[PDB]
Amino acid sequence: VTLGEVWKRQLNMLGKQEFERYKVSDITEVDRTAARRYLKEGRTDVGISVSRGAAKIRWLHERGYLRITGRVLDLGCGRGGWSYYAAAQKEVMSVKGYTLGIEGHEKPIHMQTLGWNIVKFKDKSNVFTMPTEPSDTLLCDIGESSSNPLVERDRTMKVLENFERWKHVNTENFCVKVLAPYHPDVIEKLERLQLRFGGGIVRVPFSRNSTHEMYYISGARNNITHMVNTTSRSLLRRMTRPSGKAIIEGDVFLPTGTRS
Numbered sequence: 001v002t003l004g005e006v007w008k009r010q011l012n013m014l015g016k017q018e019f020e021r022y023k024v025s026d027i028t029e030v031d032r033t034a035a036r037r038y039l040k041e042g043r044t045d046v047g048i049s050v051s052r053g054a055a056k057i058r059w060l061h062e063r064g065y066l067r068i069t070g071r072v073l074d075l076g077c078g079r080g081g082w083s084y085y086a087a088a089q090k091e092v093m094s095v096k097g098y099t100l101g102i103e104g105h106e107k108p109i110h111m112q113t114l115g116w117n118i119v120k121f122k123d124k125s126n127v128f129t130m131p132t133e134p135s136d137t138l139l140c141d142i143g144e145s146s147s148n149p150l151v152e153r154d155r156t157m158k159v160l161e162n163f164e165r166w167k168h169v170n171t172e173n174f175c176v177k178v179l180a181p182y183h184p185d186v187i188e189k190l191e192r193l194q195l196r197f198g199g200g201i202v203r204v205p206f207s208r209n210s211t212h213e214m215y216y217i218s219g220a221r222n223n224i225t226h227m228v229n230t231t232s233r234s235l236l237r238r239m240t241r242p243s244g245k246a247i248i249e250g251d252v253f254l255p256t257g258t259r260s
């Protein structure tokens with residue numbers, strides 16, 4: 001029915017090699033070699049990011065989609081890539097990161113990058129069961145992929161309901177992952193949230209062609225439906241004519257040390 005529904009069906013039909021070629025086609029990508037090399041040797045002192053995910057929040061911040069300010073809540077922080085990026089920013093006073101930590105390599109990793117001493121992590125935290133707390137900047141990077149679009153729809157709606165709960169009057173800045181934005185129920189929900197909170201939706205170019213994820217952000221106003229369909233059309237175009245090639249750029253590097 002929607003363009004994004006056509007995209008998901010066709011994606012699931014792709015052959016193994018077609019899939020691998022398509023997923024990286026014309027996407028942007030950070031080179032993670034330096035970070036991985038330093039992490040393998042346990043070098044927590046060096047100015048590197050713990051995850052690939054940090055490239056998404058840098059693009060959001062640097063391109064004017066998101067201000068990062070005051071007390072920041074990082075929901076679904078995982079390793080801490082968004083938390084440590086935030087801690088390094090001028091206007092930030094503290095970061096609190098919450099994550100399930102269901103798997104070992106998805107638990108917070110301590111670093112000594114700038115402002116590490118103003119970050120607190122709590123793993124074994126379900127942000128859906130816990131009471132909300134005030135924030136000036138609310139981040140949420142939750143949404144597990146599924147080949148089943150109905151599963152992805154439910155996951156997305158669950159994340160958006162909890163976001164509305166966590167989103168306080170209080171909260172000026174926000175960035176929330178919308179796993180599968182193309183579902184009519186998801187669009188209708190985002191539209192009512194936009195009436196309440198403002199903002200708009202953006203597609204981060206570091207996302208792989210194999211997911212339709214977009215981000216609901218405070219920093220811009222735009223038409224939800226127009227933005228989602230434009231992404232759907234881009235992803236379909238890339239499928240019929242796949243370059244099989246990502247544009248590689250430099251990773252997220254950080255200053256190091258404590259902040260007062």
Ligand SMILES: C[n+]1cn([C@@H]2O[C@H](COP(=O)(O)OP(=O)(O)OP(=O)(O)OC[C@H]3O[C@@H](n4cnc5c(=O)[nH]c(N)nc54)[C@H](O)[C@@H]3O)[C@@H](O)[C@H]2O)c2nc(N)[nH]c(=O)c21
Pocket residue numbers: 011012013014015016019023052144145146147148208210211
């Ligand atoms: C395998 N597969 C999937 N689809 C379809 O594509 C969608 C996206 O999932 P896809 O596996 O990229 O991503 P995830 O489900 O999130 O898994 P995963 O690799 O575990 O990604 C999650 C984790 O990977 C981590 N990650 C980051 N960088 C890398 C990396 O460079 N390599 C790997 N393996 N993981 C990375 C990242 O941090 C994140 O936590 C699925 O829903 C299906 O519709 C397929 N379709 C066809 N036709 N053929 C296929 O073989 C096929």
Ligand SMILES: C[S@@+](CC[C@H](N)C(=O)[O-])C[C@H]1O[C@@H](n2cnc3c(N)ncnc32)[C@H](O)[C@@H]1O
Pocket residue numbers: 050051052053054075076077078079080081082098099100101102106125126127128141142143
């Ligand atoms: C995409 S990862 C976070 C990546 C992170 N922004 C980074 O750059 O390192 C999403 C994380 O959210 C966590 N998560 C999923 N559901 C959650 C829940 N209900 N409460 C807290 N964390 C959750 C997952 O365990 C996963 O590690």
